[model samples]
Target: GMLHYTKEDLLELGAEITTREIYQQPDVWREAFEFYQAKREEIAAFLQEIADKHDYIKVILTGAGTSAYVGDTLLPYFKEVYDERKWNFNAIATTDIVANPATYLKKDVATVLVSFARSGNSPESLATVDLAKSLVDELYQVTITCAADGKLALQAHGDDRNLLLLQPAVSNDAGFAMTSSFTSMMLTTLLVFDPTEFAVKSERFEVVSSLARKVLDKAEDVKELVDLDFNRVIYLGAGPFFGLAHEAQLKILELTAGQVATMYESPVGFRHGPKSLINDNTVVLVFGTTTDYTRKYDLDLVREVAGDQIARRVVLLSDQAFGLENVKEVALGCGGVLNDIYRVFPYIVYAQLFALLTSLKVENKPDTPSPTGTVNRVVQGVIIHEYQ
Candidate 1:
């Protein structure tokens, strides 16, 4: 519906913002990567000092909603590669931390609250920063946000205790759903894990960007994939993609306004309990891996889901899924990742495009899929407590 429309037509239907943002992601990702390059030295110096000053720097990766999902998806790979002896990483939401500060913080540990946000002005985020300052013995912060004028982005002006890394403004998405905003922020956070390595190896940014463009070229194919009869959607993956599964399912729920029931679980974790939800009305999309060892588990799960014939349809997304027969398959052609964590750069575009198409398929505006006044573009009506 909305996919074939021009800019003027999309504007008439209030679908221009989300449509443009999703399609412009490849461009924004390149800009997001260049922006990180400009700050690589500064970021390295700051993180290095944090490591040098403290025996262990407790890094609390946080944000709300889509922003929070960035941390969840990146945390696994970051923890694995970031030399655990020097840093400790935790994925906590600003919503959870601000509401229950006492339970999460400790007096003796020096900490860094790495906050991710698109607008950087949510009530929960503002409160979490203040509560963290009051709770920890020694505290520093890294504000990874898109909006330069937003309070969280402005909070570090002349403040030595904080560092602000602002993403390109295009990522300050006008759409109700996060598209480029989510991918850019997620990429920026992954670069934070190691700036120098990413800077040098970062030329692969072109490889990821090119691969994303390939996916964009096949938007119609993705739309065809979306044109199915399923009423329930399930997303499965292993490791980092596990968090992405949560995000993919959330995209379906948010864009479709909960019209489609959605669930996300890891491959192994699914059969434990979640597989019971599968039915003829269900669609399961699995994001498999490129590494041989982990790839085996992903392949096994795909075969299991297909063999059981429990779902109405099953789709597999991976660098190599072409030879598989009993189910629908979308080839990523990412070939492989030189650095594994960076895989999501191209992979996430699929989830985003699917969500956009599904929204339009249901006669909802892709820009603001919520027909009722249930969810706000930037969440509203939250009150922040003044923790003394």
Candidate 2:
């Protein structure tokens, strides 16, 4: 018999998924540490292979949606590591890259494309890979995906020009969102780039794991409040968390398929005209960092909005445990950038739960809310074009 999951079943699954994510953090970190230890050599070999076979190497990290953000998050790191004068590192959206490759990839430029995907079945994903082969002089592909049977993997088979396969936790999440898959792939990229630095950063992962476990155990309080009737969600953060805020907002939007319109903003940027978007129908989610400088700004926004009765809800997700009644704080209990990344796991879990519950409240399936084909589990109807 085919198993049917009820609303409670979905909630339990979400919690179980959260627990698995927390438990897996250590293992994820260990593997990431190991991968990091050998990253320099691996990257060197990969780079060398490209240089040996082709005259020029143009590296582009591409993907769709959350997978795309994986590349966006790593853009700074890539720029810091690779000398632009020697190797050009560009992060382009797969959708855009597939649509127009020539604008990005010059003629005779030997390109090394790194693609991140969860199912690997997304139309643009396969299209981008195909487009790369047809357009670039000598194209090399490195795919990091969770789905082993995805089209991206099938396309890479027996192709000496490609390095394609599953990431560390290939079978990370069965839920509506990409929790484990996202972190695993991100960590894998970090390891592949600089293993020694990753290993040295292992202890931070352990601390982050512990903090995420704490959030998983205690997130019920926030979940209870998420049941409130709010039609809008605004996610705010600064620095690296700003990109994470954009990702967090999308998680809710994708899982719910636009049932609830969500927006992302930087803490300072929100003060401009974006603050006008807030209303009683809106729920504000603040991703507060551990840094004193960033937190000061985050708290100010929290205080500013909490003073106004316009927002129906204001929830603060952070590593700091401020026992203030005005704000609902889901604390990860860790510090630093590693802590920020660790909090991302739990912060996103909360967003997933909110989206799932919101979908259920509307008498929709948490599994497939899109019955009319507006949004498919795997994106549909994208035509890959050849770069002229």
Alpha-carbon RMSD, candidate 1 = 1.8
**What is the lDDT for 81 in model 2?**
65
Return the TM-score for candidate 2, rounded to 2 decimals: 0.81
Against the hidden reference, what TM-scores do the models get? 0.95, 0.81
lDDT of 1 by residue, 108-166 (tens): 88899999888888988888888888889899999889889888888867878798888
Q: Give Cα distance to truth, residue 233, candidate 2, Å.
A: 0.8
Q: Give the TM-score (vs. native) of candidate 1.
A: 0.95
**What lDDT tens digits, residue by residue, belong to model 2 across residues 300-330?**
8888888787888888887766776567777
Q: What ranges in model 2 sit over 4 Å off? A: 1-8, 11-44, 47-58, 77-89, 108-110, 157-161, 168-176, 194-196, 322-325, 335-343
Q: Name the 10 consecutive residues with the lowest summed lDDT in model 2.
A: 1-10
Reference-based lDDT, each prediction:
0.83, 0.68
